[PDB]
Amino acid sequence: AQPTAVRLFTSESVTEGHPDKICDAISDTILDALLEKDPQSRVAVETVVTTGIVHVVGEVRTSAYVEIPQLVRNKLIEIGFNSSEVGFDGRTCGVSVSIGEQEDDRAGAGDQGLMFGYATNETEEYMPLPIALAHRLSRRLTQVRKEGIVPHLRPDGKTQVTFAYDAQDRPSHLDTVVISTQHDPEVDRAWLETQLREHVIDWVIKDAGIEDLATGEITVLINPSGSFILGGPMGDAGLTGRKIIVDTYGGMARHGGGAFSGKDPSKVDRSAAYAMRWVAKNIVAAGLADRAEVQVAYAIGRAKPVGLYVETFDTNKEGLSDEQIQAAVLEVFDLRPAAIIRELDLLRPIYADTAAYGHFGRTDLDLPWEAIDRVDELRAALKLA
Amino acid sequence: QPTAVRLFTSESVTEGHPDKICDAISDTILDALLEKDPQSRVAVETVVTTGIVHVVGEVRTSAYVEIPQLVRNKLIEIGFNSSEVGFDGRTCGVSVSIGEQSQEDVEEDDRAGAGDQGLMFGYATNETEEYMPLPIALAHRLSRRLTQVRKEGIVPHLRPDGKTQVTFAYDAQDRPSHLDTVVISTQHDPEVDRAWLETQLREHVIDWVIKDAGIEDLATGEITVLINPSGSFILGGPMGDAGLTGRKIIVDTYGGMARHGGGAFSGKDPSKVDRSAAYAMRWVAKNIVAAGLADRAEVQVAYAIGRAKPVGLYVETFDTNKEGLSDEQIQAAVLEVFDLRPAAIIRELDLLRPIYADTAAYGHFGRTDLDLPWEAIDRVDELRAALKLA
Amino acid sequence: AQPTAVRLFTSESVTEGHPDKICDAISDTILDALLEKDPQSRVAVETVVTTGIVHVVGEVRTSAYVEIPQLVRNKLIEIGFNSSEVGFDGRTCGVSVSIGEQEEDDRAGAGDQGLMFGYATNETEEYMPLPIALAHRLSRRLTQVRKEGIVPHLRPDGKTQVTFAYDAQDRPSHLDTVVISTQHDPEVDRAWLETQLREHVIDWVIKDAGIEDLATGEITVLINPSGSFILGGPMGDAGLTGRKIIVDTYGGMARHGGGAFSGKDPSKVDRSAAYAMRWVAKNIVAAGLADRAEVQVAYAIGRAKPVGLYVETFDTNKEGLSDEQIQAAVLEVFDLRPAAIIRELDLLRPIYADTAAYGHFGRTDLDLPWEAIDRVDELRAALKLA
Amino acid sequence: AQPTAVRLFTSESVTEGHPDKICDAISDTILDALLEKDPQSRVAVETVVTTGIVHVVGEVRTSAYVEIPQLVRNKLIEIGFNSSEVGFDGRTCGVSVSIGEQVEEDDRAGAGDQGLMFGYATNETEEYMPLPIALAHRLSRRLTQVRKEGIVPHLRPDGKTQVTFAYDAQDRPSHLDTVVISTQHDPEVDRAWLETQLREHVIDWVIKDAGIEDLATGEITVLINPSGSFILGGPMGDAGLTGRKIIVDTYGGMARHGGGAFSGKDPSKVDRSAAYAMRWVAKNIVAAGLADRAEVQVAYAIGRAKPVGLYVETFDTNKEGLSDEQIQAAVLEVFDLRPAAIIRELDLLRPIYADTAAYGHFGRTDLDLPWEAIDRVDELRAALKLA
Numbered sequence A: 001a002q003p004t005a006v007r008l009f010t011s012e013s014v015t016e017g018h019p020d021k022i023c024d025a026i027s028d029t030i031l032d033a034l035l036e037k038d039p040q041s042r043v044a045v046e047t048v049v050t051t052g053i054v055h056v057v058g059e060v061r062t063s064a065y066v067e068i069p070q071l072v073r074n075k076l077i078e079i080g081f082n083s084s085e086v087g088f089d090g091r092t093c094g095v096s097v098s099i100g101e102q103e104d105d106r107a108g109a110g111d112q113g114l115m116f117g118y119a120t121n122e123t124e125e126y127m128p129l130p131i132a133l134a135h136r137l138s139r140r141l142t143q144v145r146k147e148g149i150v151p152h153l154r155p156d157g158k159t160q161v162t163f164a165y166d167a168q169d170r171p172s173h174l175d176t177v178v179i180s181t182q183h184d185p186e187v188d189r190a191w192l193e194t195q196l197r198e199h200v201i202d203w204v205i206k207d208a209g210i211e212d213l214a215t216g217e218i219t220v221l222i223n224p225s226g227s228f229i230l231g232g233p234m235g236d237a238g239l240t241g242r243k244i245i246v247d248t249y250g251g252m253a254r255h256g257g258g259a260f261s262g263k264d265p266s267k268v269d270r271s272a273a274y275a276m277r278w279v280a281k282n283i284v285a286a287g288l289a290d291r292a293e294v295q296v297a298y299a300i301g302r303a304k305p306v307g308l309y310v311e312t313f314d315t316n317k318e319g320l321s322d323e324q325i326q327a328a329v330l331e332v333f334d335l336r337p338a339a340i341i342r343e344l345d346l347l348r349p350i351y352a353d354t355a356a357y358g359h360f361g362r363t364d365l366d367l368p369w370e371a372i373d374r375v376d377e378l379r380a381a382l383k384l385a
Numbered sequence B: 001q002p003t004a005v006r007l008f009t010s011e012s013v014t015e016g017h018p019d020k021i022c023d024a025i026s027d028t029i030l031d032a033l034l035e036k037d038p039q040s041r042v043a044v045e046t047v048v049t050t051g052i053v054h055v056v057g058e059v060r061t062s063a064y065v066e067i068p069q070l071v072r073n074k075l076i077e078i079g080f081n082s083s084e085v086g087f088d089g090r091t092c093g094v095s096v097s098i099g100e101q102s103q104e105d106v107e108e109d110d111r112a113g114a115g116d117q118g119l120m121f122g123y124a125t126n127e128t129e130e131y132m133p134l135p136i137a138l139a140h141r142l143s144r145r146l147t148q149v150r151k152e153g154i155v156p157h158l159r160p161d162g163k164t165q166v167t168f169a170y171d172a173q174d175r176p177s178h179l180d181t182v183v184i185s186t187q188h189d190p191e192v193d194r195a196w197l198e199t200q201l202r203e204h205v206i207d208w209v210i211k212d213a214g215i216e217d218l219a220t221g222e223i224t225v226l227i228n229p230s231g232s233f234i235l236g237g238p239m240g241d242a243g244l245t246g247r248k249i250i251v252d253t254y255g256g257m258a259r260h261g262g263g264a265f266s267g268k269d270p271s272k273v274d275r276s277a278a279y280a281m282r283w284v285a286k287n288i289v290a291a292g293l294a295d296r297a298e299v300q301v302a303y304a305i306g307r308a309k310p311v312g313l314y315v316e317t318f319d320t321n322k323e324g325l326s327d328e329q330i331q332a333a334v335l336e337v338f339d340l341r342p343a344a345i346i347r348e349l350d351l352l353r354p355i356y357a358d359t360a361a362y363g364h365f366g367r368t369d370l371d372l373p374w375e376a377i378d379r380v381d382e383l384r385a386a387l388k389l390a
Numbered sequence C: 001a002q003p004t005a006v007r008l009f010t011s012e013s014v015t016e017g018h019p020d021k022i023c024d025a026i027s028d029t030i031l032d033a034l035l036e037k038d039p040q041s042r043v044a045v046e047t048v049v050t051t052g053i054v055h056v057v058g059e060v061r062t063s064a065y066v067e068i069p070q071l072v073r074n075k076l077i078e079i080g081f082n083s084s085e086v087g088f089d090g091r092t093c094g095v096s097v098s099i100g101e102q103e104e105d106d107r108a109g110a111g112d113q114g115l116m117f118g119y120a121t122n123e124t125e126e127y128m129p130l131p132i133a134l135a136h137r138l139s140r141r142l143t144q145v146r147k148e149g150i151v152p153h154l155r156p157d158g159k160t161q162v163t164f165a166y167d168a169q170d171r172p173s174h175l176d177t178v179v180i181s182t183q184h185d186p187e188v189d190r191a192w193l194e195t196q197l198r199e200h201v202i203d204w205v206i207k208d209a210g211i212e213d214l215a216t217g218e219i220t221v222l223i224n225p226s227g228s229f230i231l232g233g234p235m236g237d238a239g240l241t242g243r244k245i246i247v248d249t250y251g252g253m254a255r256h257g258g259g260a261f262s263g264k265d266p267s268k269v270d271r272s273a274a275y276a277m278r279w280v281a282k283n284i285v286a287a288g289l290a291d292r293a294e295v296q297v298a299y300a301i302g303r304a305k306p307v308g309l310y311v312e313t314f315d316t317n318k319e320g321l322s323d324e325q326i327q328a329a330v331l332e333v334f335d336l337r338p339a340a341i342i343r344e345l346d347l348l349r350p351i352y353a354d355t356a357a358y359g360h361f362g363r364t365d366l367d368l369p370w371e372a373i374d375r376v377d378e379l380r381a382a383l384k385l386a
Numbered sequence D: 001a002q003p004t005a006v007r008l009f010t011s012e013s014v015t016e017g018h019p020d021k022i023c024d025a026i027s028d029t030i031l032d033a034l035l036e037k038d039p040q041s042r043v044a045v046e047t048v049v050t051t052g053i054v055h056v057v058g059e060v061r062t063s064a065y066v067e068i069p070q071l072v073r074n075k076l077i078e079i080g081f082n083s084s085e086v087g088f089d090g091r092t093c094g095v096s097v098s099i100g101e102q103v104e105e106d107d108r109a110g111a112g113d114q115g116l117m118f119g120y121a122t123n124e125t126e127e128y129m130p131l132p133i134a135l136a137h138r139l140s141r142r143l144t145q146v147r148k149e150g151i152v153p154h155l156r157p158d159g160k161t162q163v164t165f166a167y168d169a170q171d172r173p174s175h176l177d178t179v180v181i182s183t184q185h186d187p188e189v190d191r192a193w194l195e196t197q198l199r200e201h202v203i204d205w206v207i208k209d210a211g212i213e214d215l216a217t218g219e220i221t222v223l224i225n226p227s228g229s230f231i232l233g234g235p236m237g238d239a240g241l242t243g244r245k246i247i248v249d250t251y252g253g254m255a256r257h258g259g260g261a262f263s264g265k266d267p268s269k270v271d272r273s274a275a276y277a278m279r280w281v282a283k284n285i286v287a288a289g290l291a292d293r294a295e296v297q298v299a300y301a302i303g304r305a306k307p308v309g310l311y312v313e314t315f316d317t318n319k320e321g322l323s324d325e326q327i328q329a330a331v332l333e334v335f336d337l338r339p340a341a342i343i344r345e346l347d348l349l350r351p352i353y354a355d356t357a358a359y360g361h362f363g364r365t366d367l368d369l370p371w372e373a374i375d376r377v378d379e380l381r382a383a384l385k386l387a
């Protein structure tokens, strides 16, 4: 048949005040506090948030002592949960702790599992446009509250971005922007719309440099359903590792299923994901392709990956195959868990910054896995100039 | 110039894995509530750690269910019936923090708005009878057989917690070509010699699945088999290993072969777009491959809170489109044929029934053991019709 | 010859805002709410409060459903904990619930072993010791003053204490010291409170009590004598059901069995026997058979018949009656089998939330069945008295 | 000539396995573990125990770190909760922790709180304890001895003992009337088997050990597991908290109580330190020939190191024509009841508390407790001009 429809692709983000991101953030704050004092701290800490209470749960091996309830109440306060009026208060909320405890170049993976990494040309950050934009809107929505550019806002928020795509699977036009924010009851829906349209949407669209993808009719949906007066843990339970697609590539890329936050870099779910980001970004910035995705997988006890899979979605260049690039990857990168930590210098308190507004393509941060410092070595292995 | 073999991996876990225990407890509560009150609103999270199950979230129902009894019964059925195994359902702790009894159905009205924003992906492939990718299909079969040989006593001394992993060598046109690596880690009784377990699992679990799945054609020659490749697995489940609902969404879907919107399925009633739309996309994709419009299809959908019609939809067929149709043409057919408003999905697929507990382990998709409404090939004729075909 | 030291006896009370009473009140709100819907409900509900969280634990058999989290949040709003400013808000607090256990009629045995004590004294019209009676009146008044606006800037958590000088006959003589620590808004000074509480709490209560003939001379008054009482309730201060048994009973003037009252349905002999034994003691003192009377009863699990009973009048017996003699009189007038006690006092009704602060006994402001002076005739008669 | 009835007075105790004494014991294991490393540790810890879970709660200020979960699981195993079989297992139960609050000197050490506390002593026994609570503690202690030493098999840790005594008209113990014991057991035995094993190896062994054969003549009504099957115990279906056994911890109802718990409180809490002191005061009043039975009440205001209350009562057992007021005068001169002085007088900054968490805090001949030393007799008499 002749009817065609336009393909729209969507990615979402959430603020630090979303109860899932609260948990990812408390988990990574506890990890950081421990690495500050004992860099070799073994840490797998789940946070759960429900009305009035934060549960801290999981396994720690450490020489340090850290005041977990103070870490929790303080992080809740930076986030902005500082009264019962806004629905949660760091100073007066519950904290419950249930923690217990159950290197070598060739020391094996602590678990089996699969981990994916992705990079693309479409943005300077090497990040797909939909999630990059969704993240920018969620960062900005927190910023205009914290710097007091828009008054009456509260920490809980979600953003969503839908883009029109050409037949070649390339971004073409910004179609639909959704922003839902928590706020005071003294503020309505019309006032919020002009505030966020001005100070968040129009602002990010300029700062991202995409004003040529945002001409004509754009559907803008601001708080399109219900009064977002209360939020965070009040009414809506949060857990660590329930925002893994927000954490990554916003659905543009595949995922091995493992969460990041609350895990020290010994956990291949976290460090191998970061490694695959590193490998992928270096594949693309070395001009071996426009888009690259790399899976790795491990067996518990074994140190050499049990698997590695390169895909460039027909963006391959210099008449190279994915099997050829992958050979180069094996030649350039060392993917034993203990080597990745050495290579990316991961034994440091840098994780709390990654718990909200993405672990990848972070221009506001300085992440070891975002370094494009293996491009030359890749080009050499493929006999390129 | 030199070349590497591309190797793809997917994993599964048994119902005894602490994350799957949470998913199963969450979907046992959902089922129990839908049996008494099909319009129940349920967003129920389970946490497990040493000695204790926490039940947490939002519930709006006219029914009463004994959560602690359901929790203990599920654990005893899973196999956690003793402190010797590391967790006993009869003696475990159960804490319940649930509210939202109205104090703070549109799912029936088809013009009713999504309950939240979000993205959802569905996928299908003619690689298997169940329209599923081989890696996850094999991993799920291995995890199901691991639990099966224990509950039926085909292999003695086994315990509930376990993990399975499958790696396949892939050709240059992204097709599976050979089984390369199989991993099976299982909780077990202390009096077991690895060699006896290695031989038992090789014969009763791996070899059995390779025949049941009909892939001996892909399992010739040298296959790497790792069984309990690390340490001793005597304690398992929540003992020294925290579990949470929604921490196995890739195992619950396509094993990394397809994309994902990030939402969990267990603990959520069909009014949750995160689950209903993902089941819908599985339906749309399976009906696109069953109608021979492609060999593989991936469909994404997205919604805005308070809005019935999706904000977006994305059909990919990975250059496998047939009948010389583009992906923009198959999508035109999809919109003509499928009602993707949430309320319409719930009705199209008759979702207000207690059928969710069985999905909480071994996958939501390609379940020939079950009869799930989103696995039905019942929209093929309508799709081919709107594509001026038959 | 050898010098004498005036004997000084103390009793203490607490507001509904004290974290331990928060727990007793919640436990008894859940009990009342189950009996409102089902009078045969079996209830053994413990409450724990700590920073931000109420835990409800224990065992129930009921045919009814009760919204525990709402009863809890509501009962914190009434107590006055309705903001993070005060250190606890019922609307945003945590609630976690771990409850389980999904002549035969009077030959029904008692659910447990145990000892329970009952006391009466003619010192007061409510037949309560002077010190715990005054104590209760002080903490009741401290709450009333905040909830009616008589004193502003007050917060719910508070403790009152009362020490009395006594004669050589174990009889009260004078009020030596009243102490009153209260929570308050940080916009207030101890000096302002000292005068406001002395006026509107201590002086009002000394009058309302009819105790001004014991009020003369120098009274030592300690008002917020330490630190600043700005936060209270569960903030920085763990609370548990069954942690205020002496405050709930006779303030140490009488003996105690050990059993908590709150969170227990009347089949729990810990409660129903102590209620019975208040009733007997009160009827002994109102019968003119002694000025002070204390009775101990003990049960064995499974046996309806008490295994022990022990009347004591501290040598204040009247009409030449021995304790043994009064004790045989009690057995004749009083069915002290669990099931009888329930029938006698009509306990299967929602009347316990009220008992959870300010005392279980001598409650003039209530209508408690165990406070009924209605076996006076049958006690006299059985003793050949007019 | 109206009819008489004999007066019957009762006391109870519970084993270390009773869910409430679990909490007290765990709370005092934490206190000890902290005093062991920091003697100035400020500890206000509550334990809660329900099916499968121990909640540890309250306030602590210490320079030390202790592995609370390790302390909990081990205490539960020592008690004998070491299996899902017996209804709770130390090795696999939950542990959740919710703690926080990281001119004369002894005059500025004012009381932590307001509160009344009570002390008691009596001639009736070698350990200066009333007869009922003394017998109940020995029965409950015996009831765990025979399990731990394999003297009576098929026993589990949960356990309750009650003791009723006939009283003569002068409020004095005449006859051992009724003994209750309810013990947790394996299914491999029944009420009848226990009936005879507990009689021979617990009850009869204790009557001889306590030397009350002359109270033990005639017809003793002995009720043993009188009701239900006691197969599962501890927290399995029965919530325990710290501070819900304060009368078993004291004198079994014979004496009065101020209503403060002991367990999980450091000696800076007067609820604990004053009560211990008051036992010490009363046990010296009685051993100094000054009386047969002595009860003393002390009371504090928060901020004030000087008691706001003192009350000596000897129940007309006072000797040498001395009034209660005169005995009180000497008590004041010989005893410093300021909180800091009590801690120093009895050396309370030591890990000695887990042993008081069961079987009584007073009259404890199996232990060596500061507040049990009769070492103020000579001084008290001197104050009354005696020899």
Ligand SMILES: C[S@+](CC[C@H](N)C(=O)[O-])C[C@H]1O[C@@H](n2cnc3c(N)ncnc32)[C@H](O)[C@@H]1O
Residues within 6 Å of the ligand: A060, A061, A062, A063, A064, A065, A066, A067, A068, A099, A100, A101, D065
């Ligand atoms: C803090 S201690 C190390 C202190 C040092 N060994 C000492 O004696 O003071 C380490 C272990 O205690 C447990 N733990 C519990 N709460 C902790 C906390 N707040 N910080 C660190 N470790 C904690 C973890 O299992 C961890 O391995």
Ligand SMILES: C[S@@+](CC[C@H](N)C(=O)[O-])C[C@H]1O[C@@H](n2cnc3c(N)ncnc32)[C@H](O)[C@@H]1O
Residues within 6 Å of the ligand: B059, B060, B061, B062, B063, B064, B065, B066, B067, B098, B099, B100, B101, B102, C065
């Ligand atoms: C028990 S249900 C319906 C009760 C019914 N309206 C009645 O007659 O009592 C009411 C609410 O209780 C809450 N709830 C708490 N525990 C529950 C449980 N075990 N089963 C069902 N609802 C429960 C949910 O918020 C639910 O919407």
Ligand SMILES: C[S@@+](CC[C@H](N)C(=O)[O-])C[C@H]1O[C@@H](n2cnc3c(N)ncnc32)[C@H](O)[C@@H]1O
Residues within 6 Å of the ligand: B063, B064, C059, C060, C061, C062, C063, C064, C065, C066, C067, C068, C099, C100, C101, C102
């Ligand atoms: C809810 S009651 C009666 C249920 C009612 N017959 C029904 O099925 O619709 C059943 C049991 O639930 C337990 N329970 C748990 N939470 C409860 C609550 N909030 N109110 C009442 N019972 C509750 C009690 O142990 C009680 O025996």
Ligand SMILES: C[S@@+](CC[C@H](N)C(=O)[O-])C[C@H]1O[C@@H](n2cnc3c(N)ncnc32)[C@H](O)[C@@H]1O
Residues within 6 Å of the ligand: A064, A065, D059, D060, D061, D062, D063, D064, D065, D066, D067, D068, D099, D100, D101, D102
């Ligand atoms: C861990 S202690 C002393 C630690 C020492 N100052 C350091 O930096 O390593 C500090 C506070 O931690 C809290 N705490 C929480 N859990 C504790 C535990 N298991 N042992 C000791 N203190 C604990 C108490 O409030 C205590 O005063």
Ligand SMILES: Nc1ncnc2c1ncn2[C@@H]1O[C@H](CO)[C@@H](O)[C@H]1O
Residues within 6 Å of the ligand: A018, A019, A156, A157, A158, A180, A181, A223, A224, A225, A226, A227, A228, A229, A231, A232, A236, B116, B305
């Ligand atoms: N009224 C609302 N409008 C839009 N999003 C909301 C609203 N209330 C809550 N949310 C967000 O969506 C999630 C699910 O309700 C919440 O955790 C919060 O982040």
Ligand SMILES: Nc1ncnc2c1ncn2[C@@H]1O[C@H](CO)[C@@H](O)[C@H]1O
Residues within 6 Å of the ligand: A110, A111, A300, B017, B018, B161, B162, B163, B185, B186, B228, B229, B230, B231, B232, B233, B234, B236, B237, B241
């Ligand atoms: N010794 C072990 N070998 C392999 N897998 C294990 C072992 N112990 C636990 N596991 C599994 O891996 C997860 C993380 O260690 C556990 O939840 C469990 O499923």
Ligand SMILES: Nc1ncnc2c1ncn2[C@@H]1O[C@H](CO)[C@@H](O)[C@H]1O
Residues within 6 Å of the ligand: C018, C019, C157, C158, C159, C181, C224, C226, C227, C228, C229, C230, C232, C237, D112, D113, D302
């Ligand atoms: N600053 C204070 N002064 C006196 N009593 C207080 C103070 N703060 C709390 N309290 C009371 O005493 C207990 C704390 O020791 C609390 O339960 C509370 O009721």
Ligand SMILES: Nc1ncnc2c1ncn2[C@@H]1O[C@H](CO)[C@@H](O)[C@H]1O
Residues within 6 Å of the ligand: C111, C112, C301, D018, D019, D158, D159, D160, D182, D183, D225, D226, D227, D228, D229, D230, D231, D233, D238
């Ligand atoms: N079957 C029983 N017989 C007697 N006492 C029991 C029995 N089961 C439990 N107990 C004790 O009585 C308490 C409450 O019933 C429990 O905490 C336990 O110590």
Ligand SMILES: [K+]
Residues within 6 Å of the ligand: A236, A237, A238, B043, B057
């Ligand atoms: K939720």
Ligand SMILES: [K+]
Residues within 6 Å of the ligand: A044, A058, B241, B242, B243
């Ligand atoms: K874990």
Ligand SMILES: [K+]
Residues within 6 Å of the ligand: C237, C238, C239, D044, D058
């Ligand atoms: K306290």
Ligand SMILES: [K+]
Residues within 6 Å of the ligand: C044, C058, D238, D239
């Ligand atoms: K109980």
Ligand SMILES: [Mg+2]
Residues within 6 Å of the ligand: A020, A237, A238, A239, A242
């Ligand atoms: Mg979530």
Ligand SMILES: [Mg+2]
Residues within 6 Å of the ligand: A111, A113, A257, A258, A259, A269
């Ligand atoms: Mg993982």
Ligand SMILES: [Mg+2]
Residues within 6 Å of the ligand: B019, B242, B243, B244, B247
């Ligand atoms: Mg997990």
Ligand SMILES: [Mg+2]
Residues within 6 Å of the ligand: B116, B118, B263, B274
């Ligand atoms: Mg969602």
